[PDB]
Protein backbone atom coordinates (compact mmCIF):
# COMPACT_ATOMS: atom_id res chain seq x y z
CA UNK A 1 0.00 0.00 0.00
CA UNK A 2 1.27 3.15 -0.83
CA UNK A 3 3.44 4.94 2.63
CA UNK A 4 4.06 1.91 3.35
CA UNK A 5 7.50 0.02 3.51
CA UNK A 6 8.22 -3.43 2.03
CA UNK A 7 9.48 -6.71 3.48
CA UNK A 8 12.76 -5.88 4.65
CA UNK A 9 15.44 -8.75 3.15
CA UNK A 10 19.16 -8.59 1.86
CA UNK A 11 20.64 -10.15 -0.77
CA UNK A 12 24.26 -12.13 0.05
CA UNK A 13 26.43 -14.58 -1.60
CA UNK A 14 26.41 -17.83 0.26
CA UNK A 15 27.17 -21.51 -0.34
CA UNK A 16 28.82 -20.33 -3.72
CA UNK A 17 25.49 -18.94 -5.28
CA UNK A 18 25.76 -15.03 -5.66
CA UNK A 19 21.88 -14.13 -4.70
CA UNK A 20 20.71 -16.35 -1.56
CA UNK A 21 18.30 -13.78 -0.24
CA UNK A 22 17.35 -13.59 3.41
CA UNK A 23 14.61 -11.58 4.57
CA UNK A 24 12.97 -10.61 8.30
CA UNK A 25 10.60 -12.01 11.24
CA UNK A 26 12.03 -15.86 9.40
CA UNK A 27 10.76 -18.12 10.23
CA UNK A 28 7.88 -16.80 11.59
CA UNK A 29 7.23 -13.74 14.04
CA UNK A 30 6.04 -16.08 17.03
CA UNK A 31 9.76 -18.01 16.60
CA UNK A 32 11.87 -15.56 14.82
CA UNK A 33 15.31 -15.73 14.98
CA UNK A 34 15.85 -12.38 16.02
CA UNK A 35 12.94 -10.13 17.30
CA UNK A 36 14.86 -7.05 16.71
CA UNK A 37 15.03 -6.49 13.22
CA UNK A 38 11.17 -8.15 12.54
CA UNK A 39 8.86 -5.14 12.25
CA UNK A 40 6.38 -7.34 14.12
CA UNK A 41 6.59 -6.78 17.77
CA UNK A 42 5.46 -9.10 20.43
CA UNK A 43 3.00 -6.83 22.57
CA UNK A 44 0.93 -7.60 25.46
CA UNK A 45 -2.90 -6.52 25.82
CA UNK A 46 -3.75 -2.96 27.25
CA UNK A 47 -6.55 -3.12 29.38
CA UNK A 48 -9.57 -1.80 28.37
CA UNK B 1 -0.06 9.58 2.93
CA UNK B 2 -2.60 9.76 5.75
CA UNK B 3 -5.17 7.00 4.01
CA UNK B 4 -4.44 4.77 0.89
CA UNK B 5 -7.88 5.51 -1.16
CA UNK B 6 -6.82 7.39 -4.75
CA UNK B 7 -9.64 10.40 -4.09
CA UNK B 8 -7.91 12.39 -6.77
CA UNK B 9 -4.58 13.12 -8.89
CA UNK B 10 -5.94 16.93 -9.21
CA UNK B 11 -2.83 19.50 -9.17
CA UNK B 12 -0.78 17.00 -6.66
CA UNK B 13 3.07 18.29 -6.37
CA UNK B 14 6.26 17.55 -4.22
CA UNK B 15 7.40 21.11 -3.68
CA UNK B 16 8.99 21.40 0.00
CA UNK B 17 6.62 24.72 0.80
CA UNK B 18 7.62 24.54 4.25
CA UNK B 19 11.68 25.58 3.70
CA UNK B 20 11.01 27.66 6.68
CA UNK B 21 9.87 25.05 9.50
CA UNK B 22 6.56 24.38 10.86
CA UNK B 23 6.38 27.85 13.29
CA UNK B 24 7.68 27.10 17.14
CA UNK B 25 5.75 29.15 19.94
CA UNK B 26 6.13 28.04 24.24
CA UNK B 27 3.60 26.55 26.22
CA UNK B 28 3.13 28.78 29.71
CA UNK B 29 0.44 27.33 32.13
CA UNK B 30 0.84 30.17 34.34
CA UNK B 31 -2.82 31.98 33.16
CA UNK B 32 -4.91 28.47 32.81
CA UNK B 33 -4.01 27.29 29.51
CA UNK B 34 -3.73 23.30 29.18
CA UNK B 35 -5.96 22.83 32.31
CA UNK B 36 -9.39 21.87 32.53
CA UNK B 37 -12.45 21.42 34.86
CA UNK B 38 -12.11 18.99 36.83
CA UNK B 39 -15.64 17.01 36.15
CA UNK B 40 -18.70 17.51 37.62
CA UNK B 41 -16.83 20.04 40.69
CA UNK B 42 -16.62 23.08 41.97
CA UNK B 43 -13.85 24.35 43.88
CA UNK B 44 -13.39 28.16 44.89
CA UNK B 45 -11.14 30.87 46.00
CA UNK B 46 -8.30 27.69 46.74
CA UNK B 47 -5.56 26.20 45.60
CA UNK B 48 -5.36 21.84 43.96
CA UNK B 49 -2.85 19.53 43.29
C1 LIG C 1 -5.38 7.96 -9.15
O1 LIG C 1 -6.70 8.10 -9.76
C2 LIG C 1 -6.71 8.95 -10.96
C3 LIG C 1 -8.15 9.08 -11.47
O2 LIG C 1 -9.02 9.49 -10.41
C4 LIG C 1 -5.77 8.34 -12.01
O3 LIG C 1 -5.64 9.29 -13.13
C5 LIG C 1 -5.96 8.74 -14.46
O4 LIG C 1 -4.88 7.85 -14.90
C6 LIG C 1 -5.10 7.21 -16.22
C7 LIG C 1 -3.88 6.32 -16.51
O5 LIG C 1 -4.10 5.61 -17.74
C8 LIG C 1 -5.35 8.29 -17.29
O6 LIG C 1 -5.80 7.65 -18.50
C9 LIG C 1 -6.43 9.30 -16.87
O7 LIG C 1 -6.51 10.35 -17.88
C10 LIG C 1 -6.11 9.88 -15.49
N1 LIG C 1 -7.07 10.91 -15.06
C11 LIG C 1 -8.35 10.67 -14.80
C12 LIG C 1 -9.18 11.88 -14.34
O8 LIG C 1 -8.84 9.55 -14.88
C13 LIG C 1 -4.36 8.05 -11.46
O9 LIG C 1 -3.60 7.33 -12.46
C14 LIG C 1 -4.46 7.23 -10.16
N2 LIG C 1 -3.16 6.88 -9.58
C15 LIG C 1 -2.28 7.75 -9.11
C16 LIG C 1 -1.00 7.16 -8.50
O10 LIG C 1 -2.49 8.96 -9.15
C1 LIG D 1 -10.46 34.45 48.95
O1 LIG D 1 -9.45 33.84 49.81
C2 LIG D 1 -8.49 34.81 50.37
C3 LIG D 1 -7.45 34.05 51.19
O2 LIG D 1 -8.10 33.29 52.22
C4 LIG D 1 -9.24 35.89 51.17
O3 LIG D 1 -8.27 36.96 51.43
C5 LIG D 1 -8.21 37.48 52.80
O4 LIG D 1 -9.35 38.37 53.05
C6 LIG D 1 -9.40 39.00 54.39
C7 LIG D 1 -10.63 39.92 54.46
O5 LIG D 1 -11.82 39.15 54.22
C8 LIG D 1 -8.09 39.77 54.63
O6 LIG D 1 -8.05 40.22 56.00
C9 LIG D 1 -6.86 38.89 54.40
O7 LIG D 1 -5.65 39.69 54.56
C10 LIG D 1 -6.91 38.28 52.99
N1 LIG D 1 -5.73 37.42 52.76
C11 LIG D 1 -5.09 37.39 51.60
C12 LIG D 1 -3.88 36.45 51.53
O8 LIG D 1 -5.44 38.08 50.64
C13 LIG D 1 -10.42 36.49 50.38
O9 LIG D 1 -11.19 37.36 51.25
C14 LIG D 1 -11.33 35.41 49.78
N2 LIG D 1 -12.37 36.01 48.93
C15 LIG D 1 -13.60 35.52 48.86
C16 LIG D 1 -14.59 36.32 48.00
O10 LIG D 1 -13.91 34.49 49.44
C1 LIG E 1 17.20 -16.97 22.79
O1 LIG E 1 16.71 -16.13 21.71
C2 LIG E 1 17.77 -15.50 20.90
C3 LIG E 1 17.07 -14.71 19.79
O2 LIG E 1 16.34 -15.61 18.95
C4 LIG E 1 18.73 -16.57 20.34
O3 LIG E 1 19.86 -15.92 19.72
C5 LIG E 1 19.27 -17.45 21.46
O4 LIG E 1 20.12 -18.48 20.87
C6 LIG E 1 18.12 -18.08 22.25
N1 LIG E 1 18.65 -18.85 23.36
C7 LIG E 1 18.13 -20.00 23.76
C8 LIG E 1 18.73 -20.57 25.05
O5 LIG E 1 17.18 -20.53 23.18
C1 LIG F 1 8.04 2.23 14.28
O1 LIG F 1 7.77 3.59 14.76
C2 LIG F 1 8.61 3.99 15.91
C3 LIG F 1 8.18 5.39 16.35
O2 LIG F 1 6.81 5.34 16.80
C4 LIG F 1 10.08 3.91 15.48
O3 LIG F 1 10.92 4.15 16.63
C5 LIG F 1 10.44 2.52 14.92
O4 LIG F 1 11.82 2.54 14.46
C6 LIG F 1 9.49 2.15 13.77
N1 LIG F 1 9.78 0.82 13.24
C7 LIG F 1 9.65 0.52 11.95
C8 LIG F 1 9.92 -0.93 11.55
O5 LIG F 1 9.31 1.37 11.13
C1 LIG G 1 12.08 21.01 3.77
O1 LIG G 1 13.04 22.11 3.90
C2 LIG G 1 13.58 22.32 5.27
C3 LIG G 1 14.58 23.49 5.24
O2 LIG G 1 15.74 23.14 4.47
C4 LIG G 1 14.21 21.01 5.78
O3 LIG G 1 14.55 21.15 7.18
C5 LIG G 1 13.23 19.84 5.68
O4 LIG G 1 13.91 18.63 6.12
C6 LIG G 1 12.72 19.68 4.23
N1 LIG G 1 11.75 18.59 4.15
C7 LIG G 1 11.95 17.49 3.43
C8 LIG G 1 10.89 16.39 3.56
O5 LIG G 1 12.93 17.36 2.70
Redesign the pocket.
Known amino acids: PIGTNYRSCESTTVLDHTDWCRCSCLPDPIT ?4 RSCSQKKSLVGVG | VIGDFNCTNFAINDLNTTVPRISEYVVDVSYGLGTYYILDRVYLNTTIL
Open positions: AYDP
